[PDB]
Design a protein around this nucleic acid. Sequence first.
RNA 1: GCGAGAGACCGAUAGCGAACAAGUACAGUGAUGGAAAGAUGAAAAGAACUUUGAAAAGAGAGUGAAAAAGUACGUGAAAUUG
RNA 2: UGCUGUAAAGCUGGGUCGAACGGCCUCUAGUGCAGAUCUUGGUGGUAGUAGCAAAUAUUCAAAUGAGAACUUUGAAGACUGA
RNA 3: UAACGAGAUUCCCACUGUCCCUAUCUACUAUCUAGCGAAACCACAGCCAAGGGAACGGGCUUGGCAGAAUCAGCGGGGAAAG
Lengths: 63, 386, 109, 172
Amino acid sequence: ANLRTQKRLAASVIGVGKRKVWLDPNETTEIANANSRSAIRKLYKNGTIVKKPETVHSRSRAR
Amino acid sequence: SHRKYEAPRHGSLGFLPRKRAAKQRGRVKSFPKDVKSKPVALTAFLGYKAGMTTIVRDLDRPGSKMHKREVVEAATVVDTPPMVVVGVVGYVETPRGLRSLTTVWAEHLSEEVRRRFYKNWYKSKKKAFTKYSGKYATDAKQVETELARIKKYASVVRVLAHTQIKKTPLSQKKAHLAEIQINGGSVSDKVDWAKEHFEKEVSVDSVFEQDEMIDVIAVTKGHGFEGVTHRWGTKKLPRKTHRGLRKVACIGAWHPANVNWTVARAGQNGYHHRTSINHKVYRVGKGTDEANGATEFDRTKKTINPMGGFVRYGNVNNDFVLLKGSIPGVKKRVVTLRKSLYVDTSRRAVEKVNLKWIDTASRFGKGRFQTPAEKHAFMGTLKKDL
Amino acid sequence: LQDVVTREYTINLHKRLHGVNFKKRAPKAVKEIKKFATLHMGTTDVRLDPKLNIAIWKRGVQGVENRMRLRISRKRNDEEDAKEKLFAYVEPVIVPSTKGLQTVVVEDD
Amino acid sequence: VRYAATPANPAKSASARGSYLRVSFKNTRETAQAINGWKLEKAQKYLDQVLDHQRAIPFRRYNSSIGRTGQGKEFGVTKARWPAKSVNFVKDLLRNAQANAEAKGLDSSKLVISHIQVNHAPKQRRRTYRAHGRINAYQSTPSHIELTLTEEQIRLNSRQRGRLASQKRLTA
RNA sequence: GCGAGAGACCGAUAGCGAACAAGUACAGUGAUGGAAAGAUGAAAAGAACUUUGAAAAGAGAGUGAAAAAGUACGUGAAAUUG
RNA sequence: UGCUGUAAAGCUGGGUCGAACGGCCUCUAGUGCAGAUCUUGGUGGUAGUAGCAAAUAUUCAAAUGAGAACUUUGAAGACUGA
RNA sequence: UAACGAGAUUCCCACUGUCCCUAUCUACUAUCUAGCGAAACCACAGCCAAGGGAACGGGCUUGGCAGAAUCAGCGGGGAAAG
Ligand SMILES: [Mg+2]
Ligand SMILES: [Mg+2]
Ligand SMILES: [Mg+2]
Ligand SMILES: [Mg+2]
Ligand SMILES: [Mg+2]
Ligand SMILES: [Mg+2]
Ligand SMILES: [Mg+2]
Ligand SMILES: [Mg+2]
Ligand SMILES: [Mg+2]
Ligand SMILES: [Mg+2]
Ligand SMILES: [Mg+2]
Ligand SMILES: [Mg+2]
Ligand SMILES: [Mg+2]
Ligand SMILES: [Mg+2]
Ligand SMILES: [Mg+2]
Ligand SMILES: [Mg+2]
Ligand SMILES: [Mg+2]
Ligand SMILES: [Mg+2]
Ligand SMILES: [Mg+2]
Ligand SMILES: [Mg+2]
Ligand SMILES: [Mg+2]
Ligand SMILES: [Mg+2]
Ligand SMILES: [Mg+2]
Ligand SMILES: [Mg+2]
Ligand SMILES: [Mg+2]
Ligand SMILES: [Mg+2]
Ligand SMILES: [Mg+2]
Ligand SMILES: [Mg+2]
Ligand SMILES: [Mg+2]
Ligand SMILES: [Mg+2]
Ligand SMILES: [Mg+2]
Ligand SMILES: [Mg+2]
Ligand SMILES: [Mg+2]
Ligand SMILES: [Mg+2]
Ligand SMILES: [Mg+2]
Ligand SMILES: [Mg+2]
Ligand SMILES: [Mg+2]
Ligand SMILES: [Mg+2]
Ligand SMILES: [Mg+2]
């Protein structure tokens, strides 16, 4: 119900910013139990936590 | 100390207080003075302000530099379907002023005038004038008794007439009911005229002729709360004045230690009752005429309506009055047209108007055609025309 | 009278947003659409599909389309206490053009 | 605890209290006076319509420089408001006193608000910061609320007697 | 300073600044400055239990000589207020 | 609730309250308040009033919860723009 | 006295709402609501005219008059406040 810690942990485990962390909205209970970085790694590996793709800055017009 | 320099006062003290009119229907404060030798006739009519147009006219004013030369003039269209006579009121001369003695009504009143007597018509049993309608039971001697009382005691007779607002494009269903004084003939003649016209329509052509000078009674355009600068036309203060400049700098001397009634103050602007006089009748149009806007020089079979209709009014499908210039009120306003209170023999009042041409281009933009036929002739075939 | 009904409407969002603060045009299109569903379905409980919110905001805070074709469904409220016996569900209709389209009853099949 | 007014028949009455309630006293006085003497069911329906802005609470004493509304015409005023926090606190106490009346066996369709009054509670102080390094008060004006639901010869002179006696003898 | 006995002294805005975790809390860079604040009841017997409420609470009940003593506690004035 | 006195005041009925207090002959004084921009404490009208307006901007849904403009998550729209 | 100057001054070109003479538009206020909620000030208060008067009255004298409760504005008076 308050996944503020899990998103902060996921950013550090994945290595991206918090703006790139996706917490499965249908797995709130499972994520809320992920109190450790070890549990965050498992959810990242399972696809419960996803690293969102980088927003594209194309250099085509500059080229 | 005195003013350093003299200037006239801003605004008129004869139009105070600058408050909202008590009613939206302008009321005839004074009717034309009654002359017995004249025939029995109405002195006023109710209409609706449709819009403004333009005409072309040859001026007949000897000694003018525009004499026998075309002038382009602004005109106002007043939609005036015939009014229905439904009642008559008798007034008695008393040392305290006129006093209404009796009001006699017609047997049948249309629904549009019976809606006048309701705030919530749709929730009502619509019981108005039903017992009165029963008063006409098989001899109608109560009505004749009241009419005889009017004949015996009344000195001023006014008819009760309502507009046929269903013939206008307005969505309002309440008719406008007003008292219109009857002038001419004896009191008995007036009462007989009123009785014989019960439930009958009276047209504008029976009240106003062309080239007449008439007065317009209306409530002007509302502007809401307004500051002194535009309400009273006072001078704006310099650009560098602290706390603002659309003010009157001095609203009074130290003494009288009060604010005077003659000082301009912010308040409600517009929506005032005005009586505007000496508007010349250029045209009393007929609703049945399919060439309302046609003249003797412009034979285009053409109604008075501009292309696309009058903006925010609609089309004038009724009889209408075409007045020179501007009259108070807004579009859709109920307008009271009153006969002149004096005899004007000046050349401006007695000139005979013959119209050359009436503008019927669109008022919704820079219209450049007078007719859809003209538009098609100018542009030719379009894609939507196939 | 059928309490459960689905119809497709065109809403003229252009005239409803006329003169509106530019940073309130997409927020007000949400309110105008809710008020639109109350007018037609008679229910003050109006729920917007999140795909409709995406379509409203697709061109930013003031890029709201002139016309949107909407599907509005009146459905029975099963909650207790609902305090509203029915509710209206509004969701977008993807059409080539939003012009010339009249109100149509959708028979859910 | 002692109520301001004791019921005439305590067996046909139920009471409720709320003390140190952090709701505007002035708003709560007006909403309490708006339902004083009403049927309980009529006041409950009325307070629901106030929360929905279908009807208003007339402000009669604490109304200086507040807005005007057409929803005050029902009560012959122009100044009326819809104080939601006060209505909710009062609805809670009407609900409580009705529960107290049900536990006594009273009939809710017969209940009437026979007594309701609002008193000042001790103020709650805060601080506001002013120009030129000044501190001012930012107090709350809380309320005490209480309510009660109640189920629905001539001696004459010698000559006065003499006149009276002699008048009887005239009437046979 | 230590140890005692007293008074036509003051009685909690008085008497020492301090009757209380008072040179305390708190302020000031610093030297220094420096409060407010006593009283349920003989005894917590400080309200078990039921009920309404999300809760705080309320209503019943209970203890007590008294709850017109419920710790927001003896009495409970005035301003001010319902 | 009244009575007495020109008065300063004294006495008394009812209510509240809970531990001391008064009359008379004298003694004594830190002995009488409407004011001092008096002191300390408390309370009003003002007044539900002034106001809560810089820093582009929020919206839909689900979850949680008695209760969600404001919490969490998702979707979007934005900004800071090294 | 060349150069320099947010120094003071006069004239000219350009420019313009500084002005003739104002009008229109935008955002934020003001406004109305829910929540929150101060302060200055306050002998008592608050309609005028004349008189006399500490010689410029809200109160006194003589007149005019005078009908609940009020909202937005306003800056004549309160010889307004500080
Ligand atoms: Mg304006
Ligand atoms: Mg300046
Ligand atoms: Mg001026
Ligand atoms: Mg035009
Ligand atoms: Mg606009
Ligand atoms: Mg008041
Ligand atoms: Mg205001
Ligand atoms: Mg107001
Ligand atoms: Mg001692
Ligand atoms: Mg002390
Ligand atoms: Mg001390
Ligand atoms: Mg004490
Ligand atoms: Mg419970
Ligand atoms: Mg006792
Ligand atoms: Mg006690
Ligand atoms: Mg006590
Ligand atoms: Mg008192
Ligand atoms: Mg006694
Ligand atoms: Mg005693
Ligand atoms: Mg004792
Ligand atoms: Mg003694
Ligand atoms: Mg002394
Ligand atoms: Mg004193
Ligand atoms: Mg003080
Ligand atoms: Mg105060
Ligand atoms: Mg305000
Ligand atoms: Mg501000
Ligand atoms: Mg979010
Ligand atoms: Mg940017
Ligand atoms: Mg030099
Ligand atoms: Mg220089
Ligand atoms: Mg320099
Ligand atoms: Mg203001
Ligand atoms: Mg004098
Ligand atoms: Mg005077
Ligand atoms: Mg004075
Ligand atoms: Mg007098
Ligand atoms: Mg002033
Ligand atoms: Mg001002």
